[PDB]
Amino acid sequence: RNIIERLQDIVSALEDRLRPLVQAELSVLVDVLHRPELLFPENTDARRKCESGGFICKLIKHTKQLLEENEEKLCIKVLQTLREMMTKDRGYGSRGEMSLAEVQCHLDKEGASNLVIDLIMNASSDRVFHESILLAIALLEGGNTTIQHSFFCRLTEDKKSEKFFKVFYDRMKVAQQEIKATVTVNTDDLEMSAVITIMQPILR
Amino acid sequence: EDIMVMDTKLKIIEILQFILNVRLDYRISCLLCIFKREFDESNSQSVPGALDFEHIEEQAEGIFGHGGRTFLRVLLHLTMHDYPPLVSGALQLLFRHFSQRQEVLQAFKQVQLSQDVDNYKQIKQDLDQLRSIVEKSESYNYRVVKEILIRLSKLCVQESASVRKSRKQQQRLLRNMGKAEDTKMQEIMRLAHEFLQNFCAGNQQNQALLHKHINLFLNPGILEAVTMQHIFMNNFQLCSEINERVVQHFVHC
Amino acid sequence: CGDHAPFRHICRLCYRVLRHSQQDYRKNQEYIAKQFGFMQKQITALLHNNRKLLEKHITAAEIDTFVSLVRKNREPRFLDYLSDLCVSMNKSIPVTQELICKAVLNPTNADILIRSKSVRELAQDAKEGQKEDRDVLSYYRYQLNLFARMCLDRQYLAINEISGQLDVDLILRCMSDENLPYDLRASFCRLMLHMHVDRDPQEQVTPVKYARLWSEIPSEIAIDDYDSSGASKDEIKERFAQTMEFVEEYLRDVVCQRFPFSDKEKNKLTFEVVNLARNLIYFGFYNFSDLLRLTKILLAILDCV
Amino acid sequence: LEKKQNETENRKLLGTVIQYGNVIQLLHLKSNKYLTVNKRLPALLEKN
Numbered sequence: 001r002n003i004i005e006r007l008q009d010i011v012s013a014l015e016d017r018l019r020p021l022v023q024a025e026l027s028v029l030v031d032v033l034h035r036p037e038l039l040f041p042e043n044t045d046a047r048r049k050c051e052s053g054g055f056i057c058k059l060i061k062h063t064k065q066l067l068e069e070n071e072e073k074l075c076i077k078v079l080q081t082l083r084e085m086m087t088k089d090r091g092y093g094s095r096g097e098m099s100l101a102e103v104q105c106h107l108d109k110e111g112a113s114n115l116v117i118d119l120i121m122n123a124s125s126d127r128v129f130h131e132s133i134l135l136a137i138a139l140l141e142g143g144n145t146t147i148q149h150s151f152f153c154r155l156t157e158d159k160k161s162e163k164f165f166k167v168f169y170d171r172m173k174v175a176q177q178e179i180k181a182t183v184t185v186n187t188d189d190l191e192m193s194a195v196i197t198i199m200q201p202i203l204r
Numbered sequence: 205e206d207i208m209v210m211d212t213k214l215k216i217i218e219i220l221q222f223i224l225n226v227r228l229d230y231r232i233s234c235l236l237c238i239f240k241r242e243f244d245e246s247n248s249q250s251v252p253g254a255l256d257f258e259h260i261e262e263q264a265e266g267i268f269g270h271g272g273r274t275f276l277r278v279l280l281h282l283t284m285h286d287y288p289p290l291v292s293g294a295l296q297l298l299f300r301h302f303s304q305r306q307e308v309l310q311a312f313k314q315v316q317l318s319q320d321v322d323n324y325k326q327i328k329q330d331l332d333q334l335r336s337i338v339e340k341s342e343s344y345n346y347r348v349v350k351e352i353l354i355r356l357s358k359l360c361v362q363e364s365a366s367v368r369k370s371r372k373q374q375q376r377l378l379r380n381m382g383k384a385e386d387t388k389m390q391e392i393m394r395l396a397h398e399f400l401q402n403f404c405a406g407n408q409q410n411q412a413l414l415h416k417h418i419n420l421f422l423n424p425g426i427l428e429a430v431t432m433q434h435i436f437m438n439n440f441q442l443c444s445e446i447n448e449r450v451v452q453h454f455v456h457c
Numbered sequence: 458c459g460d461h462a463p464f465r466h467i468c469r470l471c472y473r474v475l476r477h478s479q480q481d482y483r484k485n486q487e488y489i490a491k492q493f494g495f496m497q498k499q500i501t502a503l504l505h506n507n508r509k510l511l512e513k514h515i516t517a518a519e520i521d522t523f524v525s526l527v528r529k530n531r532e533p534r535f536l537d538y539l540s541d542l543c544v545s546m547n548k549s550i551p552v553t554q555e556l557i558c559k560a561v562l563n564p565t566n567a568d569i570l571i572r573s574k575s576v577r578e579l580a581q582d583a584k585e586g587q588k589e590d591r592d593v594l595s596y597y598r599y600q601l602n603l604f605a606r607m608c609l610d611r612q613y614l615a616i617n618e619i620s621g622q623l624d625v626d627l628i629l630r631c632m633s634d635e636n637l638p639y640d641l642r643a644s645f646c647r648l649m650l651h652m653h654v655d656r657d658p659q660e661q662v663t664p665v666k667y668a669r670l671w672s673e674i675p676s677e678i679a680i681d682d683y684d685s686s687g688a689s690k691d692e693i694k695e696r697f698a699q700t701m702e703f704v705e706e707y708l709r710d711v712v713c714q715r716f717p718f719s720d721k722e723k724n725k726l727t728f729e730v731v732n733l734a735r736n737l738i739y740f741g742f743y744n745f746s747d748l749l750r751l752t753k754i755l756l757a758i759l760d761c762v
Numbered sequence: 763l764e765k766k767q768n769e770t771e772n773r774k775l776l777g778t779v780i781q782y783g784n785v786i787q788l789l790h791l792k793s794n795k796y797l798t799v800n801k802r803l804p805a806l807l808e809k810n
Contacts, residue, residue, distance in 0.1 A: 002670065005670065007241060008236075008241045010241070011240075011241025011242045011244065011245050012236075012241065012245055012311075014242060014245055015242075015244070015245020015246060015248075015311075016245070016308075016311075016312060018245070018246070018254075018255065019308045019311075021254065021255070022254070022255045022259070023304075023305050023308050025255070025256070025259060026255065026259050026262065026304075026305070027302065027304065027305040029259050029262070029263065029266075030262075030266060030301060030304065031301070031302075033263075033266055033267065034301065037279075042279070042283070043267070043279075044267065044268070044269070045276070045279055045280075045283070047283060047761075052761075057283070060286070061282075061286075061291065061294065064286060064288065064291050065291065065295055068288065068291065068292065070292065070295075074292075074295040074296065074298075074299055077298070077299050077302065078295065078298065081298070205721040205724070205725075208721070208724070208725060208728075209721075209724045209728075209758075212724060212725065212727070212728030212731075213728070213755060213758060215728055215731060215732065216728065216731045216751065216755060217755070219731055219732075219735050220748075220751075220752070220755070222662055223735075223748060225664075226662055226664075227745060227748075229664050229666055230666070230680070230683065230741075232666070233666040233668065234677045234678055234679075234680065237668075237672065237673070237675030237676075237677070238675050238676070271749055271752065273752075273753075273756060274749060274752045274756075276756075277752055277755060277756045277759065280756070280759050280761070281755075281759075313664070319669065319671075426802075455802075456802050456804075
């Protein structure tokens with residue numbers, strides 16, 4: 001009778017099922033707390049108050065990591081984290097109003113979007129591409145008016161990133177032609193991969 | 205010297221990365237050995253609103269925060285001003301917070317793939333893998349090393365189970381396949397293809413699926429038709445994986 | 458030479474610039490490199506690579522000449538530079554190491570080019586107290602260690618292990634006694650011994666907690682001391698424990714009360730010790746408590762202010 | 763109608779300075795036949 005072992009496996013599976021249900025949420029909450037803390041005077045830390053107290057550090061660090069490149073896996077996790085920080089409307093209940101006018105406003109008080117323009121400029125990985133803009137709609141955080149109004153002013157800097165955006169677009173044009181050949185004819189689909197799917201979201 | 209301290213501490217911190225990584229794994233095994241199956245799972249170790257208060261129940265244990273100070277220390281490590289080598293270490297630490305979730309994944313980390321049989325496979329299976337790896341790693345010097353990949357790991361025991369997905373999971377080189385030259389490398393590749401087919405030999409339904417997943421240089425209809433026919437045909441996979449136009453490709457094939 | 462001043466000073470910096478230009482250059486430095494040796498004699502053999510160049514600097518006679526000069530030399534910094542032990546696997550494992558060892562070993566072998574130890578330490582302290590007492594040891598020790606240790610080679614290290622003393626305790630005591638190179642030297646010696654033990658297997662961390670249906674002893678609830686790479690049972694364990702205890706006990710105290718900039722070498726030694734602990738320390742829950750302190754020690758170092 | 767539209771492009775198209783890197787078409791006059799290379803139908807001597 002290996003039934004006890006089987007039962008243990010079942011209990012573990014139940015625990016795992018719960019894990020699937022939350023730890024996404026729980027993990028997000030921890031990360032979210034960190035984002036708030038960074039905005040925060042270190043979430044009750046802020047370098048023990050003092051001279052080194054502690055407001056706006058996460059944004060500075062993020063800019064440096066983006067510049068760094070790397071084994072990109074850390075960057076991908078960080079991109080997910082940036083989205084999570086924008087990734088909002090729950091968990092609050094430092095009474096900041098949970099609106100991007102405050103939030104991405106303070107995120108534009110942070111203003112880390114040059115790296116997204118750099119993510120629009122340099123596109124090393126397709127996952128770096130498909131997430132460098134995949135959260136980048138936060139750069140238009142509802143209003144995004146300064147993120148427009150400075151981003152348009154930021155558009156007068158170099159050629160670099162603008163050329164990269166054009167390449168991605170051109171990339172979309174090529175992809176569309178391929179897709180057209182790929183749809184081919186009628187007279188079902190797997191979602192047309194996503195290359196196409198990715199392009200539709202990106203286009204939006 | 206500051207980064208010699210800092211990345212030295214980062215060396216300790218990266219040491220502390222796998223140090224707590226190791227600690228977490230050991231703790232999980234110990235917990236797993238006795239009691240609490242349902243309770244143990246719920247306990248961890250440290251409809252829409254199910255855990256949403258238990259997260260709030262972690263929220264006081266997070267917002268206020270057996271070492272709490274150690275968790276705070278991880279935050280201080282993140283708190284260093286600007287160390288690009290140190291910044292890389294900080295990025296690793298940031299992922300590491302992710303370690304609680306990682307630990308949940310780590311608890312799962314029970315996957316992959318009898319006893320004495322496993323040891324024998326490691327002695328060989330491992331040898332075949334090593335030969336292939338060496339060949340990739342090191343005209344014909346890797347082609348001189350190709351016999352370790354083609355001949356070594358050539359006699360696969362397809363009678364023994366645990367080989368189909370697990371040797372499929374154990375075989376990284378095969379997965380990578382799934383530099384064509386008319387010389388030593390080309391000969392080695394042809395031999396390897398035959399040997400590989402024999403090794404896969406453990407996909408009657410699953411083996412076929414694995415082969416399909418592995419493929420990119422195949423299923424055109426033209427460039428590899430005779431070989432494709434030899435590999436497969438006239439079966440239950442010829443009735444479901446048997447979509448047409450191959451003779452249109454075989455019209456050029 | 459055949460028959461100083463401002464001209465000499467001006468020429469010195471110019472020589473430094475020349476060295477940088479050959480060092481920076483690749484595919485471009487053959488006779489400049491050939492050229493360097495004579496200049497070295499007057500006042501990048503591995504530093505700039507020279508795959509071909511590295512081999513060329515490998516004038517066996519050139520190495521021998523440098524060693525002879527140092528031996529009758531009485532001029533130390535050049536000996537350390539010559540001493541090498543290059544990265545790139547320690548200069549190709551003594552592709553540099555072999556030469557140095559034979560050359561260094563040969564010179565030591567036929568030349569220089571407990572209680573007694575305590576007496577020597579006292580004498581060294583007196584020398585330190587004055588201005589010409591014992592000011593050869595730190596540099597000498599560093600050079601010897603590097604020379605006998607590039608890249609963890611074969612029994613030439615046991616030739617240096619012939620001058621070993623088997624004394625981790627003595628080495629630790631020496632480092633503590635002279636806030637210097639002797640202690641750091643003890644750590645280097647410990648690393649060499651550890652490397653010899655490690656040839657045994659290269660102890661990487663394995664995550665295989667695969668206990669089968671035949672499972673392990675399932676009563677390991679709170680393992681304060683897990684099985685680790687103390688060099689076997691009691692002797693290895695004791696040595697590791699003693700070293701760890703002293704460092705934490707000593708390192709922790711220093712960190713808690715030391716100044717933020719005065720023991721760069723001490724910090725380096727701590728990092729080396731941590732690396733050594735990873736290679737060898739594995740003592741579990743108890744070890745974990747030590748790790749918490751290291752966690753605590755790390756926090757103490759940060760106790761940033 | 764689309765073929766008619768192809769013409770109702772070519773007439774407009776006359777005037778263009780013919781430059782490097784372009785993609786153009788051809789047609790005979792004496793036989794007045796077209797040019798098309800197959801991607802799956804081979805030659806007589808070599809199948810390649």
